[PDB]
Amino acid sequence: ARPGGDTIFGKIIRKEIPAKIIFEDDRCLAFHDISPQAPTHFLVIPKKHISQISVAEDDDESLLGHLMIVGKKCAADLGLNKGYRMVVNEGSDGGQSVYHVHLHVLGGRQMHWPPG
Amino acid sequence: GDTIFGKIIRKEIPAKIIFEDDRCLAFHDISPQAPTHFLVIPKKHISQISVAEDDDESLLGHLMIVGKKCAADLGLNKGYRMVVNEGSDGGQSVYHVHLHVLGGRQMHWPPG
Ligand SMILES: Nc1ncnc2c1ncn2[C@@H]1O[C@H](COP(=O)(O)O)[C@@H](O)[C@H]1O
């Protein structure tokens, strides 16, 4: 059990697969999405492996909130001064493709409603 | 300034409440975009995620944990999408921080 696991995102955490990194600390990593859906589109992920939000534990609250605080700070650092949308996809109906928790941050254009 | 979400927290206008604790409130969205569409909001008036403080971390994480628990209780066993909107480009509709939780249909990509 390599730390962070062997999903795409676990490999990125251990520098085994390349990524365009915006910010890194002891708890999380922010990097650009390889298939962007907006002019700016990045991901914020914990270093701790949690497969999906539906299985997060109560004591994971601080870490999940940290993803949002880092996401909003990275958005400011990238000049997203008109705003942005944060997204978590859970399971099949959420469209989830990578089973390591992650927060999308999208901006640099007008986002539409409904959010998919 | 006050918002309609402040009025909902204070019980001044009605909403279909799903869950409440000492620090947040979850309730069905009045303009639902999926068969299940609810909001989880802090009782603290944070106007937008861009002005949240570092010491709000665990409160924000609490919104997500409450959101995922309410989703399971509402029977969203095939999954769901969580969304926080910021500002004009994000489509933020009320200037009181709120986590959307949507499910009961396939959610699509891009997410708006
Ligand atoms: N190697 C990679 N580097 C950066 N982003 C990725 C990589 N592989 C997948 N993604 C993105 O990860 C997200 C996974 O889908 P989802 O689980 O629905 O959020 C998608 O937006 C992908 O484009």
Cα-to-chain-centroid distance, residue A41? 10
Choose one of A6, A8, A53, A87 to mutate for the ligand 1 pocket test, by most ligand atoms within 8 angstroms of C-beta: A8
Architecture of domain B1-112: 2-Layer Sandwich (3.30)
* Side-chain half-sphere exposure of B67, counting CA atoms within 13 A: 32
Q: What single-letter amino acid sits at A94?
A: G
- The finding on whether A34 has its CB within 6 A of some atom of ligand 1 is yes
Identify which of B56, B104, B108 has the shortest CB distance to residue A65. B56
- The finding on whether A86 has its CB within 6 A of some atom of ligand 1 is no
Method by which this entry was solved: X-ray
- The finding on whether A35 has its CB within 6 A of some atom of ligand 1 is yes
Q: How far apart are CA A22 and CA A67, in angstroms?
A: 13
Beta strands in chain B (DSSP E): 17-20, 24-28, 36-42, 80-86, 99-103
So what CATH class is A1-116?
alpha beta
Domain residue spans of chain B: 1-112
Token pair belonging to A75: 């958005």
Query: How does DSSP assign A47-107, residue by residue?
Result: SS----GGG--GGGHHHHHHHHHHHHHHHHHTT-TT-EEEEEEEHHHHT--SSS--EEEEE
Token pair belonging to B36: 């299940």
**B-chain residue closest to A102, CA distance:** B82
**A-chain residue closest to B93, CA distance:** A113
B103 in Cβ contact with B81 (< 8 Å): yes
Resolution in A: 1.4
Tell the burial category of A15 from Cβ atoms under 10 Å away from its Cβ (0-12, 13-18, 19+). Answer: exposed
